[PDB]
Amino acid sequence: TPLQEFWHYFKRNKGAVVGLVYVVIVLFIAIFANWIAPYNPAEQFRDALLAPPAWQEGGSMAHLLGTDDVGRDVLSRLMYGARLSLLVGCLVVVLSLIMGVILGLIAGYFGGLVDNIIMRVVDIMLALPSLLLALVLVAIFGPSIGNAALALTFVALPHYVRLTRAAVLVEVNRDYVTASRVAGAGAMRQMFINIFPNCLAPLIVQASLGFSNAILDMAALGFLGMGAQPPTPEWGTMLSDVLQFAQSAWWVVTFPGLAILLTVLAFNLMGDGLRDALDPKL
Amino acid sequence: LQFILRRLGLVIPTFIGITLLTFAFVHMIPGMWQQYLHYIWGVMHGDLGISMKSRIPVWEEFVPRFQATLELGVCAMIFATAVGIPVGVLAAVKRGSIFDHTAVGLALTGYSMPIFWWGMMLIMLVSVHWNLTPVSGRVSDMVFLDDSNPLTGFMLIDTAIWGEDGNFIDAVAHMILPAIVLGTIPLAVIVRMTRSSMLEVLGEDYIRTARAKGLTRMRVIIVHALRNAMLPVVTVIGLQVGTLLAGAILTETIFSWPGLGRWLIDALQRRDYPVVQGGVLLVATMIILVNLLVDLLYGVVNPRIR
Amino acid sequence: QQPLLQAIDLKKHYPVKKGMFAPERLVKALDGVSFNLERGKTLAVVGESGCGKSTLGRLLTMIEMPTGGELYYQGQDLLKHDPQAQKLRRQKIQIVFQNPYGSLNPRKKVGQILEEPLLINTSLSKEQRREKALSMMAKVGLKTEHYDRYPHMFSGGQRQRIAIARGLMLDPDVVIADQPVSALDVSVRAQVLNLMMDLQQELGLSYVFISHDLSVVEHIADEVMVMYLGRCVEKGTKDQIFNNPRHPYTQALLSATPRLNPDDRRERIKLSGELPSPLNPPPGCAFNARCRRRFGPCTQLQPQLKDYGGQLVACFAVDQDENPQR
Amino acid sequence: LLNVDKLSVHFGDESAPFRAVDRISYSVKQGEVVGIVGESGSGKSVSSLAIMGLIDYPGRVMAEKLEFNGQDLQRISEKERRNLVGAEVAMIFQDPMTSLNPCYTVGFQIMEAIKVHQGGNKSTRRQRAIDLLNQVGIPDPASRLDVYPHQLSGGMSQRVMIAMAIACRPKLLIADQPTTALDVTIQAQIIELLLELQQKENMALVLITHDLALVAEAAHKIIVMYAGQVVETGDAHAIFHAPRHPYTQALLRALPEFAQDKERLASLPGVVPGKYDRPNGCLLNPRCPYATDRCRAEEPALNMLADGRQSKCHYPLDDAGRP
Ligand SMILES: Nc1ncnc2c1ncn2[C@@H]1O[C@H](COP(=O)(O)OP(=O)(O)OP(O)(O)=S)[C@@H](O)[C@H]1O
Ligand code: SF4
């Protein structure tokens, strides 16, 4: 059965299973943050301002990963940040995948004027870097977590349109799509019942790169001030205006970036696992 | 002929679209047919607007930024191409070795890197703890040049041809961290694509013919495999050159670099829309010309197209 | 009485660009093919690559519209823009493709693949569709346990069996077979050929059997049509075309076909050059570049099919052999 | 010339290997044409790539003897193998379109083949390449040096492969299904070219193909492969008038040439044994119509027969076709 064959090959990539274990742990930390986090992410311990991690001489077990420049606990902020990072990445990937697959099937199946109109709009909105276009839209529409997520949803559509349109043109020339047309299948059946199940293998791997890019680009928007706003526990926002702490408080600079890097690396490890399992490569 | 004409026929509809959407931005967000003609006529005469804080014309602000971004982008792409290509070839040739697992492992770590944070880490290690390399700026505030000379505006050229003794190694020391930081995602993508390309090509029937002629393993790799495995590589390179500005907004901000990304993000934070509107047009323009150049390069190397 | 299927003057020209947008050349992939096919008979279409045999297959199963000519089933026209003609087009004429690996959807179960034709074209319930599909599997030599499996779980012969089984679901009476046994092994080939002859004798099917292998055609065919550069060059019953080939290309194609039995090994005649590209077709007769019998009219005119003792050949040298005044 | 003994080629783990070639033995004399006939999964192509050293990292090769021209291909150095491969043994492959490097012109690929073994200046090499393209029948050899592989037909691509293989005048040419992809007239042209080179240069030729009729016209000796094993050997006329192995008999009865107009063709039941499906005793036990309890216990020897032929059977067939 093909789902057990996929899982059998996914288990062969040891790095991909390490990625999946981390993603389940960070999802559990994201769901249960209210109960796991030792303090509220906006509460200020002004008696313990710039206190180092529990393993350094000025620190205590009261604050495992230390405090920031207003006395907030860094551990709790990192895991409420894990919650925001996964919710934005999930919303971006689902909406960009739905709208991009439909426009790519409509382009790749019907061809002609529809393919030309769709692909010229896609080539126009790829004339700028993804982050620069997201920054311009969030600066026209004001910086907020919602605005940043809608900008990231919009600038990601080109990749799903271009990939789906590329996969559909490789299937539409094949004898099984032709045999289905000789049997009388209409456009709706041809796209969604016959061609789409064959395009789904490329798309399952592209969603993992989408999660990685949504996390990197949301953290980039937050770092540049054009994203989640200053009181919020978002990981890029925690790195906005911290560079003066590189000498005095290394933990403020270090741990939000390990939380980003670790999470993006886990989705990228898992993605190359999906690639090894879905392609006839091994 | 025909390949160039077929690609120019897709660049022109894209450039018309970029110009129409920039006219819509300039009309809708202040700092039909007759107004569009008046706008593109002004842009063709260099009337891109006036920057609200400085009151300098947007083109007269731009040129120094473009040079200081191109100098950095060149060095970052030199690092990425020089180091990445040899490592991807060795990784594919030594498949399953400690070198392959390390090359794949480090490339995946670089491809997942938050650029802005990793430059703070290298400031913290290299510039604060070890104290080897300067934290900020394009050249030391010690360095000044007589403006009488025909200075190019590229510091690595200018400080070599017209600089005092010891100024050039300062202009290089300031370049090292920005070039390594900006070059890391490109390097990772070039290692990944060079490896996958080479493993694809090393499995082809013409490599079995090359072995069956009695060719040396080095000649099968460099002459037969790598010429074919370079075609895909060319493409990605093209892709990455377009994406370097994204990495430059993040890199230039932490290193306080004079540059086109720092100028754009400061304009977006100010709501200095005259700089954003002229800047996205010039950036867009550069990207599509770069893309066109690359694809002409690909259609010259590739015999199937030539 | 009208024949089961009749083609009159079929053509298919594809327009093409000579590295420039203006010059608008035609690729004459097929021009001037005509035949009558009777019920319970096999017409074999034979020739090398570039001869038009596969575009003829695509026209007859209505995958592509023709540029000209007529196509009648039992005396009524199949080329109309008419929703009443769909009930002939999809039910009565069906196709078996060349490639067993590309002609089955790899993400569908065999039951799904066989029931899709019935779901689109018929009123049958989910139970009745399964009963008809399992009966067709049993007719074609697949097991009842195979109904749940995906195409990748089957050998090339079992895949060509699913493809034959899908083709027969709507109860056809013409089946177009585009090189159906080319990829298969000797044994599997044998297997597959026995099945197609059993199905013809049982159900009454007529085959348009498009083939490069003349050994298989000498077994399965009743009538043979020989193709060169989009035109029919020789047409006749199997015994005429294999025991008395009159056209120079048929003689060359049979002389190039390898034969195991030493006594059947014909005089070797070896042709020069490549088969010419249809973007730049030769003037006059298409074979004049390769032919051993080149003669005055051959570079000036296209020949036409004429009856010379009960078989048709398009050749001026045969016309002079039968009419010495030519 | 070539002397293969107990040759085996394996894939996968040594506790349960896929035996793609399994203790085969054959010999080729200089000036002989040897056909290797088999179905899918027979190991025929693999046996020849093991002479060339083209079996790769997940595979293994072992033999009791593997001499070419008096040199043991199991124990010579990498340099000494490169001094045989292309110079004394050469090979042409199944697909004309994928087998030439698409980034280099035909003249570069032939002049490179000449350079690796014979050397010489540019002029000399170019002259010898024009000589070879004229020898394999290219219609204008001077302009065809400058074409890229995508500009060639399948027939011209295979003629370029023959010119590139024969460039150093080898003692043995291996042809792994050289004409499977080509039209019938182009197949006849290429095999009459190979047989003209074979006779004119006094060269050994190994034809590996599934087409019995094509080998019956071309070959002196035929070797029949099944499930990685040789099952019959003999002269190309005798082997198909009176077959000595049930497998070869079955193989002939499945050809549409071997029957009246529209009578049903015979065919063996079952499928060729893969890694997991492999029977004890004779590998034809599940399929052989003459199977007996001896065949289920014993692996049969490659029995030497009275007329000089061999068949891997406990009961070699008489002239009427019975055990
Ligand atoms: N879409 C097309 N546009 C232009 N020429 C075409 C097109 N499709 C097919 N041809 C040409 O049609 C000619 C006639 O032969 P085909 O109909 O393609 O069948 P065939 O080549 O004889 O059989 P094949 O090789 O097994 S598909 C070929 O030379 C093709 O190059
Ligand atoms: S018409 Fe002329 S060229 Fe054509 S086959 Fe006859 S003799 Fe040959």
Ligand code: SF4
């Ligand atoms: S040894 Fe027995 S099973 Fe094998 S081929 Fe001979 S008779 Fe058949």
